[PDB]
Design brief:
This protein is an all-alpha fold and 86 residues long. 43% of the residues lie in helices and 0% in strands. The longest helix has 15 residues. It is classed as antibiotic biosynthesis.
């Protein structure tokens, strides 16, 4: 359905917040427990994503993205937003 952004892309966007970290299982997956693992409630990461998209150029989906509980959701969010943007 979409193939604009990539999983590795969301990774970098999330590293900007925490570059250094000796606690991450990046040898199999990082979505099964990314938002739940760290303390990133939908109320904290909300504004964080609001600015993260300011550079993307795509629309401003703060509602659906604001209530993002899982990490993989954020990726599929900006992705579909870019496809429709064009």
């Amino acid at each position: 359905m979409a193939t604009l952004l990539t999983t590795d892309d969301l990774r970098r966007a999330l590293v900007e917040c925490a570059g250094e970290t000796d606690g991450t299982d990046l040898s199999g997956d990082f979505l099964d427990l990314r938002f739940e693992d760290i303390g990133y409630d939908s109320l904290a990461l909300m504004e964080t994503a609001a600015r993260l998209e300011s550079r993307y150029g795509v629309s401003i989906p703060d509602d659906v993205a604001g209530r993002v509980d899982t990490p993989r959701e954020l990726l599929d969010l900006i992705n579909g937003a870019l496809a429709e943007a064009a």
